[PDB]
Scaffold this active site. Structure first.
Site, short mmCIF file in Angstrom:
data_model
loop_
_atom_site.label_atom_id
_atom_site.label_comp_id
_atom_site.label_asym_id
_atom_site.label_seq_id
_atom_site.Cartn_x
_atom_site.Cartn_y
_atom_site.Cartn_z
N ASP A 157 -3.42 -4.16 -3.86
CA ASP A 157 -3.30 -5.61 -4.41
C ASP A 157 -4.27 -5.90 -5.60
OD1 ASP A 157 -1.76 -6.21 -2.16
OD2 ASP A 157 -3.62 -7.37 -0.96
N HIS A 174 2.91 -5.22 2.51
CA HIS A 174 1.57 -5.45 2.33
C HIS A 174 0.76 -4.18 1.49
CE1 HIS A 174 0.93 -9.37 3.71
NE2 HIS A 174 1.76 -9.15 4.69
#
EC number: 5.1.99.4
Lengths: 354, 354
Positions: free
Chosen positions: A150, A120
């Site tokens: 992200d 992540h």
């Protein structure tokens, strides 16, 4: 009715960067069709038509390919090799549509020793020096939410790659594959620190530099009410305006950039900001060049005049959501269409003539 | 030889987001001419030709407009009204080139009560809720460098706007003005948190959410040597792999998502990670989906196999710099050209046919 009106985008449902990129395309006017597994309250799924297909089935693959044959852009954010095994890899899509920009959104990239490994945002910025640089110096690093991997170094780079490849297509007549890896994009996002490291202008010490909280003129301060202001007064003339607003005599303070006395300087500014509440400082510095602003929590943002007057947000339903950015003078973006009901995939195909 | 080969860009020299947008354009193959005031060690000024002109003079304004007349894109990052006053405003440029994408990079935007006010990254993210959300819960907010306003929500949105406007121009034959305000772009960058706030998935409490360091499975941990690892083990199966590597028995720990016992869970994970050095955890988790990675300082990044094997960086005379991102399968970007000596502005005009 933004500048991307006319652009056809097929989005293979995923999480985080992929749908954020798709959202921005839709925001700017693109016709985005998201394929999900067989009405969302997720505001990120604004500006879509949602269709359903089983990509593992013969029927679902056929329909996805008919849709892709008519599109400009395909977005996928699966592990490398997943679309290939589904029958939706770049070589298969090329057979039906060699004008397709095939946009692959991952953290580690299409190849390399970590390319098949889960992760992540925090993992991608851990490996390239970014995470190490964020937080107070006397504590372990803190994640800057998932803003940097992200989104800033992720979906944003996917978008630049998609739109750049569309520019390239004007003259080649063809698309190609965009490999947007968060580990790469976040590195370019922080290029300024790599540049500064090379010239002695940035150090690897966390919390001890100009822009990381190390500088007393570039940091937050707690006020009398336990709320905060942010000080960003880098230039001497802005720094001077900040002191004037505080009523402090510069002759009685350490010099702005004498780092040996930064703790003393910060102690004096801390005492000053602590003497009144945040909104007192918000008023004192509302209109000046002191670079002092109130630190607003999300719930307070919709009450700030600059936010209101520019319509940075709109009310979706039970909440504020950001209006499209950036802004265009001639082909302005519309307020986003809310998430709607799932529609029939054949109806889209009829619409797109595929 | 990237996808933006052939694109002509005029950059009016500035600081922060403007030059970073110009850099990425040049990275991807654009022909970027930067006009400075009358050899840089600033690696950000890679992939340019630098020319010099006094914009306040008759000669300098005339030359700037001749260049602008032949360009696709103009980038400026001054206070609103500054180019207008110089004779380089959008209406003046339109008279010589109505195909021009006029890209205006600011913090507060072109209009609004703060549009004439000085500021830096920290100020823009103070006003829209972002800065409040970054840092540990028991301390004042910490700036995530200038990654979120200047770059993620700044230059990256300027770039999307530039390239989206170029797509629009394929059908219209005309350019327009892009107003990229960091206050807006960063709000779209954080749209996921606005979405989550509306559905009970995010709170305004700093340091108490899934992705801000609040969750024990999404945070850094200090190891025996005082270095850190990053844990991003959100999904249950990745979390399980993380516990397996630490040799902890899941039946003896609080459940992953029992927030009432998060301090207990964190204390157990803290003791475990503290028992060995960062290197050790790298070995334990090297090829697993535990989402555990070493937190590398900038200086160690070049030694990491995944970083090396993918050529995420290149060496400039002196230090490492990030290679262009994202990547393109067919029209790949070149290794960036280092900053070079200033050149004759008339040489550029002759080249462009101005």
């Amino acid at each position: 009715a933004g500048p991307l009106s006319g652009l056809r985008v097929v989005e293979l449902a995923g999480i985080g960067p992929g749908p954020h990129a798709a959202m921005i395309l839709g925001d700017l006017g693109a016709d985005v069709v998201r394929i999900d597994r067989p009405i969302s309250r997720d505001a990120m799924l604004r500006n879509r038509r949602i269709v359903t297909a089983d990509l593992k089935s013969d029927q679902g693959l056929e329909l996805a390919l008919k849709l892709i044959a008519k599109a400009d852009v395909l977005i996928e954010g699966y592990r490398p090799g997943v679309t290939e095994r589904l029958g939706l890899g770049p070589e298969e899509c090329a057979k039906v549509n060699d004008r397709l920009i095939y946009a692959r959104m991952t953290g580690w990239g299409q190849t390399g020793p970590r390319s098949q490994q889960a992760g992540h945002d925090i993992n991608y910025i851990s490996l390239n020096g970014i995470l190490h640089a964020i937080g107070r110096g006397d504590e372990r690093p803190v994640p800057p939410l998932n803003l940097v991997g992200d989104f800033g170094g992720g979906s944003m780079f996917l978008l630049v790659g998609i739109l750049a490849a569309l520019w390239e297509r004007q003259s080649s007549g063809k698309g190609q594959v965009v490999d947007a890896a968060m580990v790469d994009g976040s590195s370019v996002l922080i290029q300024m620190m790599w540049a500064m490291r090379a010239t002695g202008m940035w150090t690897d010490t966390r919390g001890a530099n100009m822009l990381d909280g190390g500088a007393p003129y570039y940091d937050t301060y707690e006020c009398a009410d336990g709320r905060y202001v942010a000080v960003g007064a880098i230039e001497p003339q802005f720094y001077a305006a900040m002191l004037a607003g505080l009523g402090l005599d510069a002759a009685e303070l350490p010099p702005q950039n004498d780092r040996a006395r930064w703790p003393e300087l910060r102690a004096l500014l801390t005492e000053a900001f602590a003497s009144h509440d945040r909104d007192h400082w918000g008023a004192v510095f509302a209109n000046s060049d002191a670079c002092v602003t109130p630190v607003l929590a999300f719930g307070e943002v919709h009450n700030e005049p600059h936010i209101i007057e520019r319509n940075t947000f709109y009310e979706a339903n039970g909440g504020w959501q950001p209006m499209p950015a950036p802004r265009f003078s001639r082909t302005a973006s519309s307020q986003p269409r809310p998430p709607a009901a799932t529609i029939d995939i054949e109806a889209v195909l009829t619409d797109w003539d595929g």
